[PDB]
């Protein structure tokens, strides 16, 4: 075959619109998500929330290096305590767009041999029945675009309950963290350091 | 190659006549 | 330790009493593999299988019938 | 217990830029060599892995560990379906010339 | 001017010119074939391999051996690690910060809020004394 | 020269200016302004305004201060004055411009307007910090400053490690040296890998041990060893962890620690190598003195 100089008006617009549409998508998604605060509510509830977070981090952070100081905390603890839209919106709409404006062409030649049923779906524009395995219509180039475009976005540069009973649940975890795990540090540090830095 | 192509290197206008001959439309029919 | 080393090299006895708050195993791979089974079985085997005879039509040999004759004619 | 840091977030990400930069110039060279498919795939693999090892040679100073966790895992097979399809984009667009 | 961004531009452009060269030869490979009833890649290939190797080279020099200065001093005293990247082990990563007199904990150590309000008053008085100094 | 911004990136995050000599601080502001005005390339807007206020606060730290008004007026363009920083800049301006206490009461009702949580928790955390910083000038110094911290600290925000760290200083200077150990443990609770709370938590134990009984002397020294060794796992050339290990080993000097003295000496001589600046003077002083 001999396709004639439509490489300007389709292939470039297809890559170009994918580039702009995704860059816009990241800008739009970033715009849509705004917290701008936690809330504007009274003082107390965030205050005891961060107390709860202090307990939570004590589970991870402070529950390792406190062989002497483990028990001293626990008295205190008990007393003190007690996008899919981003997928759907752009790309489905532009499937309609491309089939609307770009149809009924053989746009290019993929380099690789597909199987016949790939050649079933891709050429809905053309109405030949034994054309070839390799040639493809316009919409196939889109089908290759969406899954291959992550390097482009990198290279241009872009990047990514009950109020009281749950307190009792973490008080039960305060009870659990007493002797569920007493971690072996401030005992093996001499062994570990002599094992290393030689 | 550098010299000849740099001389080349130093908008659409949709002209019909070259299109005809490239696709073989321009032909002589001997009857 | 411009000042901490200096404070350590000499002797210091500065302290007093203050209130101070008055503070007091191959299962994982066996498990995961069938999830590779399910897509190939259910959808890629919809119409997209190699090794069945319809995939070699591009590679099918060109039957040679005459190979020494022309049959020019009207 | 080997310590891990948020430092790695940069250098890990940094590596991606090298490979993604090495994955859209590929495809174009394949298309300009005007190639069939399986020749193209083997060409892709040999250039891709030579780029990977020379990256381990030069940017990394022959010390893949001490820069990444699971380093032998990550240089070869991580981000491998993240860029093979980009290579297909590059290869289709190049071979149309 | 260092060679990396130069090499990016010349490598993209030499690939672009190899592109126009291959445009002319390979468009006139099948278009001229139409004149022959559907009837030098080699130096094209050699200049292509030049372009690929040079672009590969181009990417490397955008990565430099990391080189640093001391925070407290005002002389140069340029601190070289002889290293390209930044490592993952927290102990020696903490090293490369401690070559500087800095602490990524930062504010917790220094407590800017209490210190500053006295610091500005006394420091203006203090340097006013040091103005002879 | 883009290498300059690296220090600036440090100086915003580290507040390195805070403990700088006015001689080198004056150098710093001069060295800054040339790159601030000249090297305007390739740096983010957020970094721009963080550098711009850090110019303001250097200038207030400087002995000439009229330029502070310049920088503040140029930086007043964005987000008005409601963010935490412009509350800081206006308070320190109103407090320095005439040496009038006024900003506190204009800030006082602000916290009574924070009763609705009109701003984020970190904001009035910092307001609590800087209003106390004002008040310790109102009440020029006392131990009850910490008692004031308690009504601000144990009631509202344990999470700020800076508060417990600062409280440690006032306990450590003349107060009981044991509650600093608890508070520094709490600092460890907040952040896993503070390796200077590690050195300090051992030093406060050592100073406590200097005034304790013999069995408590050995007990606290042994705990101090294991805390200074806990320093070492977070860093190789950390001058203060290795040094404090070597110090209590100088005090004790017993056979296995004599080997650790040899290892610490190799590491401390590596530290006292000239890769490090000025700190080497303190490191070498203790190395070669005894």
UniProtKB/Swiss-Prot annotation, chain A:
One of its GO terms (biological process) is phospholipid metabolic process. InterPro entries: EMC3, EMC3/TMCO1. The keyword Hydrolase does not apply. Signal peptide: none annotated. Keywords: Endoplasmic reticulum, Membrane, Transmembrane, Transmembrane helix. GO terms for cellular component: EMC complex. The chain crosses the membrane at residues 9-29, 88-108, 138-158. GO terms for molecular function: protein-folding chaperone binding. Pfam families: EMC3_TMCO1. Coiled coil: none annotated. It is a multi-pass membrane protein. It is found in: Endoplasmic reticulum membrane. Component of the ER membrane protein complex (EMC), which is composed of EMC1, EMC2, EMC3, EMC4, EMC5 and EMC6. Belongs to the EMC3 family. Part of the endoplasmic reticulum membrane protein complex (EMC) that enables the energy-independent insertion into endoplasmic reticulum membranes of newly synthesized membrane proteins. Preferentially accommodates proteins with transmembrane domains that are weakly hydrophobic or contain destabilizing features such as charged and aromatic residues. Involved in the cotranslational insertion of multi-pass membrane proteins in which stop-transfer membrane-anchor sequences become ER membrane spanning helices. This is ER membrane protein complex subunit 3. It comes from Saccharomyces cerevisiae (strain ATCC 204508 / S288c). The lineage of its organism: Eukaryota, Fungi, Dikarya, Ascomycota, Saccharomycotina. The gene is EMC3.
Curated annotation (Swiss-Prot), chain C:
The chain crosses the membrane at residues 25-40. InterPro entries: TMEM85/Emc4 (IPR009445). It is found in: Endoplasmic reticulum membrane. Pfam families: EMC4. Part of the endoplasmic reticulum membrane protein complex (EMC) that enables the energy-independent insertion into endoplasmic reticulum membranes of newly synthesized membrane proteins. Preferentially accommodates proteins with transmembrane domains that are weakly hydrophobic or contain destabilizing features such as charged and aromatic residues. Involved in the cotranslational insertion of multi-pass membrane proteins in which stop-transfer membrane-anchor sequences become ER membrane spanning helices. Belongs to the EMC4 family. Component of the ER membrane protein complex (EMC), which is composed of EMC1, EMC2, EMC3, EMC4, EMC5 and EMC6. Present with 1320 molecules/cell in log phase SD medium. PANTHER family: ER MEMBRANE PROTEIN COMPLEX SUBUNIT 4 (PTHR19315). This is ER membrane protein complex subunit 4. It comes from Saccharomyces cerevisiae (strain ATCC 204508 / S288c) (Baker's yeast). The gene is EMC4.
Swiss-Prot record, chain E:
It is a multi-pass membrane protein. GO terms for biological process: phospholipid metabolic process; phospholipid transport; protein folding in endoplasmic reticulum; protein insertion into ER membrane by stop-transfer membrane-anchor sequence. The chain crosses the membrane at residues 6-26, 44-64. The keyword ATP-binding does not apply. One of its GO terms (cellular component) is endoplasmic reticulum. It is found in: Endoplasmic reticulum membrane. Its main location: endoplasmic reticulum. Keywords: Endoplasmic reticulum, Membrane, Transmembrane, Transmembrane helix. Pfam families: MMgT. Present with 5240 molecules/cell in log phase SD medium. Part of the endoplasmic reticulum membrane protein complex (EMC) that enables the energy-independent insertion into endoplasmic reticulum membranes of newly synthesized membrane proteins. Preferentially accommodates proteins with transmembrane domains that are weakly hydrophobic or contain destabilizing features such as charged and aromatic residues. Involved in the cotranslational insertion of multi-pass membrane proteins in which stop-transfer membrane-anchor sequences become ER membrane spanning helices. Belongs to the membrane magnesium transporter (TC 1.A.67) family. This is ER membrane protein complex subunit 5. The lineage of its organism: Eukaryota, Fungi, Dikarya, Ascomycota, Saccharomycotina. The gene is EMC5.
Swiss-Prot record, chain F:
It is a peripheral membrane protein. InterPro entries: EMC2-like, TPR-like_helical_dom_sf, TPR_rpt. Keywords: Endoplasmic reticulum, Membrane, TPR repeat. It is found in: Endoplasmic reticulum membrane. Its main location: endoplasmic reticulum. One of its GO terms (biological process) is protein folding in endoplasmic reticulum. One of its GO terms (cellular component) is endoplasmic reticulum. TPR repeats lie at residues 161-194. Part of the endoplasmic reticulum membrane protein complex (EMC) that enables the energy-independent insertion into endoplasmic reticulum membranes of newly synthesized membrane proteins. Preferentially accommodates proteins with transmembrane domains that are weakly hydrophobic or contain destabilizing features such as charged and aromatic residues. Involved in the cotranslational insertion of multi-pass membrane proteins in which stop-transfer membrane-anchor sequences become ER membrane spanning helices. Belongs to the EMC2 family. Component of the ER membrane protein complex (EMC), which is composed of EMC1, EMC2, EMC3, EMC4, EMC5 and EMC6. Present with 5740 molecules/cell in log phase SD medium. This is ER membrane protein complex subunit 2. It comes from Saccharomyces cerevisiae (strain ATCC 204508 / S288c) (Baker's yeast). The lineage of its organism: Eukaryota, Fungi, Dikarya, Ascomycota, Saccharomycotina. The gene is EMC2.
């Amino acid at each position: 075959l001999l396709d004639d100089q439509l490489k300007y008006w389709v292939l470039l617009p297809i890559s170009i619109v994918m580039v702009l549409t995704g860059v816009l998508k990241q800008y739009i998604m970033t715009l849509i998500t705004g917290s701008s605060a936690n809330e504007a509510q009274p003082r107390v509830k965030l205050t005891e929330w961060q107390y709860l977070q202090w307990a939570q981090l004590l589970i991870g952070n402070g529950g390792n290096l406190s062989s002497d100081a483990f028990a001293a905390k626990k008295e205190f603890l008990v007393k003190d305590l007690t996008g899919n839209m981003a997928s759907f919106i752009p790309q489905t709409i532009i499937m309609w767009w491309v089939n609307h404006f770009f149809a009924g062409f053989i746009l290019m030649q993929l380099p690789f041999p597909l199987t016949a049923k790939f050649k079933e779906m891709l050429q809905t524009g053309i109405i030949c029945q034994d054309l070839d395995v390799r040639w493809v219509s316009s919409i196939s180039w889109y089908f290759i675009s969406v899954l291959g475009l992550n390097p482009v976005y990198n290279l241009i540069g872009l990047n990514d309950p009950p109020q009281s009973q749950v307190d009792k649940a973490m008080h039960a975890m305060a009870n659990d963290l007493t002797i569920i795990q007493h971690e072996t540090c401030l005992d093996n540090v001499e062994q570990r350091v002599l094992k290393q830095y030689m | 190659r550098l010299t000849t192509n740099w001389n080349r290197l130093i908008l659409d206008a949709k002209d019909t006549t070259v299109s005809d001959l490239k696709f073989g439309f321009a032909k002589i029919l001997i009857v | 330790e411009w000042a901490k080393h200096l404070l350590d090299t000499k002797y210091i006895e500065k302290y007093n009493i203050q209130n101070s708050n008055t503070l007091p195993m191959f299962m994982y791979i066996v498990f995961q593999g069938v999830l590779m089974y399910i897509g190939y079985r259910k959808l890629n085997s919809m119409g997209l299988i190699p090794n069945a005879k319809g995939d070699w039509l591009p590679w099918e040999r060109i039957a040679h019938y005459n190979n020494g004759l022309q049959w020019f004619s009207d | 217990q080997i310590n891990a840091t948020a430092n790695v977030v940069d250098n890990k990400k940094r590596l991606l830029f090298v490979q993604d930069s090495s994955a859209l110039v590929l495809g174009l060279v394949a298309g300009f060599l005007q190639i069939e498919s399986v020749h193209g795939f083997i060409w892709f693999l040999i250039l891709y892995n030579l780029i990977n090892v020379i990256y381990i040679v030069w940017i990394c100073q022959l010390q893949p560990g001490k820069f990444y966790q699971s380093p032998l895992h990550d240089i070869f097979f991580e981000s491998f379906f993240r860029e093979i399809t980009g290579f297909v984009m590059a290869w289709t667009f190049g071979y149309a010339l | 001017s260092f060679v990396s961004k130069l090499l990016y531009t010349v490598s993209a452009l030499v690939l672009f010119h190899s592109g126009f060269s291959s445009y002319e030869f390979h468009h006139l490979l099948k278009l001229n074939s139409l004149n022959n009833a559907q009837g030098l890649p080699k130096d094209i290939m050699y200049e292509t391999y030049a372009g690929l190797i040079l672009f590969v080279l181009a990417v490397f020099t955008s990565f430099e051996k990391l080189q640093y200065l001391p925070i407290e001093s005002n002389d140069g005293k340029i601190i070289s690690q002889g290293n390209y990247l930044k490592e993952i082990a927290l102990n020696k990563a903490t090293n490369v910060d401690n070559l500087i007199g800095s602490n990524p904990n930062g504010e917790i150590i220094f407590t800017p809020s209490f210190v500053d309000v006295h610091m500005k008053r006394k420091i203006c008085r203090e340097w006013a004394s040091n103005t002879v100094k | 020269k883009d290498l300059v911004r690296e220090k600036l990136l440090t100086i915003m995050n580290t507040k390195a200016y805070t403990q700088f000599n006015p001689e080198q601080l004056l150098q710093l502001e001069n060295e800054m302004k040339i790159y601030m005005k000249s090297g305007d390339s390739a740096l983010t807007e957020g970094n721009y305004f963080f550098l711009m206020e850090m110019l303001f606060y250097v200038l207030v730290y400087r002995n000439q201060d009229v330029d502070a008004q310049v920088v503040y007026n140029t930086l007043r363009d964005r987000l008005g004055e409601n963010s935490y920083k412009m509350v800081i800049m206006k308070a320190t301006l109103l407090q320095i411009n005439g040496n009038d206490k006024g900003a506190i009461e204009y800030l006082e009702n602000l916290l009574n307007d924070d009763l609705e949580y009109e701003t984020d928790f970190v904001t009035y955390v910092s307001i609590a910090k800087k209003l106390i910083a004002i008040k310790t000038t109102s009440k020029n110094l006392s131990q009850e400053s910490v008692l004031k911290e308690v009504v601000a600290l144990t009631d509202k925000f344990p999470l700020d490690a800076e508060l417990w760290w600062y409280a440690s200083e006032i306990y450590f200077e003349m107060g009981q040296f044991e509650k600093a150990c608890y508070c520094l443990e709490q600092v460890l609770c907040i952040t896993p890998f503070n390796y200077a709370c590690f050195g300090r938590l051992s030093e406060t134990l050592y100073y406590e041990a200097l005034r304790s009984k013999k069995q408590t002397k050995t007990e606290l020294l042994e705990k101090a060893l294991k805390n200074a060794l806990r320093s070492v796992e977070l860093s190789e050339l950390y001058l203060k962890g290795w040094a404090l290990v070597n110090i209590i080993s100088r005090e004790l000097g017993r056979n296995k620690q004599n080997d650790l003295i040899k290892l610490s000496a190799s590491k401390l001589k590596e530290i006292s190598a000239k890769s490090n600046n000025k700190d080497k003077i303190t490191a070498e002083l203790i190395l070669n003195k005894i």
